[PDB]
Amino acid sequence: CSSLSIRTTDDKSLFARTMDFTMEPDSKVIIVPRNYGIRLLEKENVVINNSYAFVGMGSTDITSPVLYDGVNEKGLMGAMLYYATFATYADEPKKGTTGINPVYVISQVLGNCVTVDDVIEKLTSYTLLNEANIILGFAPPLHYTFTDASGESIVIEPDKTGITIHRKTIGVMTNSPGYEWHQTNLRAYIGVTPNPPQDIMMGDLDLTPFGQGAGGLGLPGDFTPSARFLRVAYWKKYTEKAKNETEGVTNLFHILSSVNIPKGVVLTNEGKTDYTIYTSAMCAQSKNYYFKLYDNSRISAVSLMAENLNSQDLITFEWDRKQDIKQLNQVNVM
Amino acid sequence: CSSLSIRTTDDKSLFARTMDFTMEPDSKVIIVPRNYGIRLLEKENVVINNSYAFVGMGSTDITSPVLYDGVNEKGLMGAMLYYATFATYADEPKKGTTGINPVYVISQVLGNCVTVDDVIEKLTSYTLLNEANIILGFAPPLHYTFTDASGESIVIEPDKTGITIHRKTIGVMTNSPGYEWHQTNLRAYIGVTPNPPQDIMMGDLDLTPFGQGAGGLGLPGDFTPSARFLRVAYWKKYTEKAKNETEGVTNLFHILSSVNIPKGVVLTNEGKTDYTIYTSAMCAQSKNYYFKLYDNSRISAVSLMAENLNSQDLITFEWDRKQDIKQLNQVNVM
Amino acid sequence: CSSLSIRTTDDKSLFARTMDFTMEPDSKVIIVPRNYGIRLLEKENVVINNSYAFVGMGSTDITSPVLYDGVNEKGLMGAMLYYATFATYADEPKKGTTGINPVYVISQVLGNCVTVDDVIEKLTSYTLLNEANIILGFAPPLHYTFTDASGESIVIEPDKTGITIHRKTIGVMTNSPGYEWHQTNLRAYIGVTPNPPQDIMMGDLDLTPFGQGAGGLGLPGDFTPSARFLRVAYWKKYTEKAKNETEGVTNLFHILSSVNIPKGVVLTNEGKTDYTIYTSAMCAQSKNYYFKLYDNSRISAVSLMAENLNSQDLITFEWDRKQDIKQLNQVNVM
Amino acid sequence: CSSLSIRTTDDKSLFARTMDFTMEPDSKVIIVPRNYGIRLLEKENVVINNSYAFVGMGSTDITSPVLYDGVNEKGLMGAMLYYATFATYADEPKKGTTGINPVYVISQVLGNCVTVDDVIEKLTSYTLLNEANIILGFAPPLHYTFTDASGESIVIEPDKTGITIHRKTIGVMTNSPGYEWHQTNLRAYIGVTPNPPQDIMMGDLDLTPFGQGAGGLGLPGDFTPSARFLRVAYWKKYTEKAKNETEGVTNLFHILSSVNIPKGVVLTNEGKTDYTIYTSAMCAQSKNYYFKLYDNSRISAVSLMAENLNSQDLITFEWDRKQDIKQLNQVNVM
Questions:
Q1: Which residues of D fall within a CB distance of 8 Å from C176?
Q2: Which of B234, C180, C325, D53 has the fewest beta carbons closer than 10 A?
Q3: Selection from D27, D50, D48 nearest residue D39 by Cα
């Protein structure tokens, strides 16, 4: 998966992510209303009551709602991303703390924090444990990213040596390795710019670019996590500032399109295709949730604040996996 | 610009392209009805009567309709793409032939040919001339690509040494240099595949990939024409076969998303941003035209065959440059 | 193999090449004296008498001396390099011409031409034929490069469509594909320069290079022919001008060291290691021949003009495959 | 600078490095005899008496001999390399320790340690201080590498957060960033191998490599520290094992030839050329020191054990900057 956040000229903060997996567990957009309550562990019945209502993409297949990404009524934004080979979970909670299933971090954090600091604070009383879940059959290796209404972003990584916290980062996050490795990697590519190389000569031969684009020489085009990090960061740097929230959603989806994996281009060892199942964007100030999926490029929006945040039940929105083509005249839908 | 064509499992042929420019001349989807008549030169009043009706993206700003890409009522598909530094036009027609403005080639070819061979034949009686047009102020450097209802693709390049014709090619085409250069370039990148490298050791150190995606090590991620060529070709090779025309349109748009330029990431010497203004797909057998634009990811369709092909007038469809977000609940449209 | 030619500030022309093969046929530096006579075909006994004496690296394993590279008494320089998949030879000579084994072109050219034009001229009366030789068991796919005392360089390629001649080229040549393909490829890499990228920022993050070298971002480091072409050309462009012939030899060996293959880093499909068996340099005005080999980094020189160019016999110099370490004190030679 | 160590099949350990700088301070090979005594600080007169004799490349321009690299009479090998932007030194020694000039670490370590553990131990009583020297005018940013007679290698980095120690590493070291960053970077390149990609097809087009070499697709050919790290590591992995010490010296120099910078190809911001001034190799068991310099490819050897290790004075060997060409016949030395 890939992810980044931007700031509009409107003083709006937006966060966006791609979901790249080999299978599509039933997911839908879920609204979790205040005081719905969320499990901490799937094999323990302790339920923490959630102070805030929140909206995002998740699963309803286990006891409490599982959120992949989402926005708060308070403006906090966040998402779970894979962190293969690096994510390390303990067997029992560290002394004092309570254990938490890695898969419930977003729902817990979104239901209860306002700022990035709130998030850092809330996690000191928890210990991520190696508890599996019946959807994947194991506890997925994950790292986490959160963005405030203010635009401050953090990265929390459950490393071998313990939780590593990254404060006020560049607002870009994909997969392994660790945030510091990626941020140091940016330095080797500072020469990837929007501008063309000057023409040169080789003896009497005039050498000029094939057309436009040659400032990017060096950016990798493959779909590895590191390559995707570079592409989201550099294109985040250079694409124009969003003037408002709508420009923001469409700019965010443009940047992520450079890291959008078509089915069949990436296969696992297992031979499974790793592709971009969906792409979402969130706005902290409006609390709106936007998304497009593999089979439908039409963006769909759900407003959190439009619902009753004290409803007893979860308010869900199903995916429309058909391509929403608009017919200008009578097309033959085929 | 970038362009490719695929074959569905349905026996359907589709062609798609991106339009990358620094400015948006008024363009709309235009239907040109049979016997509408098309100029050959803008400074001469000879009008060739077109046998076939056709639909595509173009301009109505000069005497006859200018088409950028399009489909026929016969199934022929084609498009004009830039060919900077390579395109060469004569001053006067070669002996016997009539001169043609390079900007009118698609309209003429689409109004009158059925097969790729018809196209090759029709051009032997013409000479592309250096006639400017009032939209750009000059005659743009261009090369052309055409795809039959059968799926056979050709490339026509107005080179220094004359028209170069490429028969039954891989069905990919971006910008300069010449088709043969890019097709040879593919060979250097045959190791870019979907599958992960085996793990290795360095003494006692175990080395394994950061996650998925490493088979692509080597593919360039910049927006140069050569880089874009490679990306469209390799991803055309590895994304899954379209099972029908709709999968075909969405698969085409996925492949091209790897060569979609966000505003600001490519600047000319002039400092102008070169970006993907629109993206279109065509189906030879259905004669349907699909498109999305920069500011709207919702695909829109026009059917050629749904209109009266003997209308006297042009049937046009305007662009909707607003992001067509579908509201699932009452979003606040902002 | 890789090859290039430079011009000193002394008005000296030098040519150098690496020999990359999977096996070392007995080769030695050979002096061919005037009027020694060279076969044209190995299965025909016609012997062309050679007007000029010449020196270079070759084999004495077949009827006439086979030269891989070399200099004349006239200052003409040249070498045979592999051109796999591209080199095409006829079965019978074209009408009029006499057939020539591709393996005897350098000996013939060096024994009889003075300028690059003489070379182009002399080849019009010959047809390269598919005649094998008992060393390789087949006729190797080859292309040729020649450099005048003036410093004018050409490239002769026996293509499918016939001999292709490249006049006054950039003075670089490796393997396939064709000279024009590589010369065009230079244009995609004009941004590879000696100078560092300007520092940039990402929000509040200062991004700066790891150290020196970043102007080269984009140059490929692998040992493919195309990559080696780029490396020799770009490093030829930016390494300092040779002030004299000795600087020339060492500058030439420095440039080629970036395309020097250590045993084990490149294997064929056969699993054979492709490595740099030797590296040579020639000076047109002095007619000196320099060489180093895999196992000895000490450069060895032979002067052509120092021998009797009317000798009846070949004057040969054997390879010293031991590393010629100079002992400053009593080292223990182990 | 670049550096690596290998193990022969002879049970010999060898270490080698390139010296890449913009200027050549007078350097020569220096033998430091036992009990010669080495300063710790240049502005303090405390002299630590050195237990062991050692040989390497260094400067005699300040109070005590400055060594860049070298071997012991005990078999310990090591070198100083730049670590720009990362190296951090204190103003005053930490409580208990004595201050040491970063430029004297090799001399001190080589004169007093046997194993990599001895090295780690010895440094716990010192604090690297920001003391300049009259040669550069400042305290150069450096990191250190050491290799035992056993073949165990470590990396010591004076980081912002304190000395960072890397135990039993892969035996490769160039410049910034930190050792762990480079070791993680290896993982993105595990697909760079000696073996050719399988041939593929694009429709009916057969696609095959230009020749040999395509398994390396992905390796960068630029001279940045990161790119040089990769090249030394991957080529260290795949070049054949040294069967004895001489093969070891020549294999070492072959691997480092991929990271050998010709004058003119890298320029600083200042416009100064950063080039490979010299290249050296050391063998732990024989205590032999080997070197070649920019202008002479002939390897020169000094044996430590051949001198009197109790001499009162330094035993020095000057550089021969002329290219040591061996004349096979009477060449004209020009």
A1: 210-211
A2: C180
A3: D48
Total number of domains in chain A: 1
Q: Is B312 exposed, middle or buried (0-12, 13-18, 19+ CB in 10 A)?
A: exposed
DSSP letter for each residue of C255-306 = HGGGG---TTS-B-TT--B-EEEEEEEEETTT-EEEEEETTEEEEEEEESTT
C-alpha of B92 from chain center: 28
Q: Which of D218, D306, D331 sits opposite C303 (nearest CB)?
A: D331
| CB < 8 Å & 24+ apart, contacts of D179-187 | D179/D143, D179/D155, D181/A181, D181/A184, D182/D226, D182/D229, D183/B205, D184/A177, D184/A181, D185/A185, D185/D226, D185/D229, D185/D230, D186/B202, D186/B205, D186/B207, D186/D230, D186/D233, D187/A177, D187/B207, D187/B208, D187/B209, D187/B210
Residues sharing a CB contact under 8 Å with residue C95, sequence separation 6 or more, in sequence order: none
Q: How many Cα atoms sit within 13 Å of A90 on the Cβ side?
A: 14
Phi and psi at C193, nearest 5°, equal: -130, 175
Q: Which residue among A212, A255, A327 places its CB closest to the CB of B262?
A: A255
Annotation marks residue C113 as catalytic: no
- The set of residues, in sequence order, having a beta carbon less than 8 Å from that of A185 and lying 6+ positions away, is A226, A229, A230, D185
Who among C192, C240, C300 is closest to D328 (CB)? C300
The span from the CA of A333 to the CA of B303, in Å, is 10
**Best of D5, D187, D234 to mutate (most B CBs within 10 Å, chain B):** D187
Distance from CA of D254 to the nearest CA of A (A): 26
d(CA C281, CA A278): 59
- State the best of A81, A229, A237, A265 to mutate against chain B, taking most chain B CBs within 10 Å: A265
Chain C partners (3+ C-beta pairs within 8 A): A, B, D
Does residue A229 contact residue A172 with C-beta atoms inside 8 Å? Answer: yes
List the beta bridge partners of residue A296.
A293
Q: Which method was used?
A: X-ray
Sign of CA dihedral D39, D41, D43, D47: negative
CATH number for the domain including A250? Answer: 3.60.60.10
Residue C29's SS3 state is strand
Q: Which of A184, A187, A226 sits opposite D188 (nearest CB)?
A: A226
CA A172 to mean position of chain CA atoms: 9
| Residue B45 dihedral angles phi and psi, to the nearest 5° | -100, 15
Q: What angle is formed at CA A85 by the lines to CA B238 and CA A224, rounded to 5 degrees?
A: 30
Distance separating alpha carbons of residues B139 and B133, to the nearest angstrom: 6
Q: Determine whether B263 is exposed, middle or buried from the number of CB atoms within 10 Å of its CB (0-12, 13-18, 19+).
A: middle
Resolution in A: 2.8
CB contact under 8 Å between A262 and B263, yes or no, is no
Q: Which residue in chain A is spatially nearest to C188 when comparing CA positions?
A: A209
Cα separation of C328 and B228, whole Å? 57
DSSP-assigned states of every residue in C135-149: TTSS---EEEEEE-S
**Residue B216 belongs to what domain range?**
1-334
Asked if A331 and B300 count as a contact pair (C-beta separation under 8 A), the reply is no
Backbone angles phi, psi at C56, to 5 degrees: 180, -165
- Burial class of residue B327 (count of CB atoms within 10 Å of its CB; 0-12, 13-18, 19+): middle
How many other C-beta atoms lie within 10 A of the C-beta of residue C124?
Answer: 11
Tell me the C-alpha distance between D125 and D95, whole Å. Answer: 9
Closest CA to B103 of B52, B48, B42: B42
Distance (Å, whole) CA B114 – CA B120? 11
DSSP state of A129: B
| Rounded Cα distance, A71 and A64, in Å | 17
Residues of C in contact with A197 (CB under 8 A): 190-191, 193
Does the distance separating the beta carbons of B258 and A196 come in below 8 Å? no
Q: Choose among A328, A239, A333, A319: nearest CA to A279.
A: A319
How many beta-carbon contacts under 8 Å exist across B and C? 11
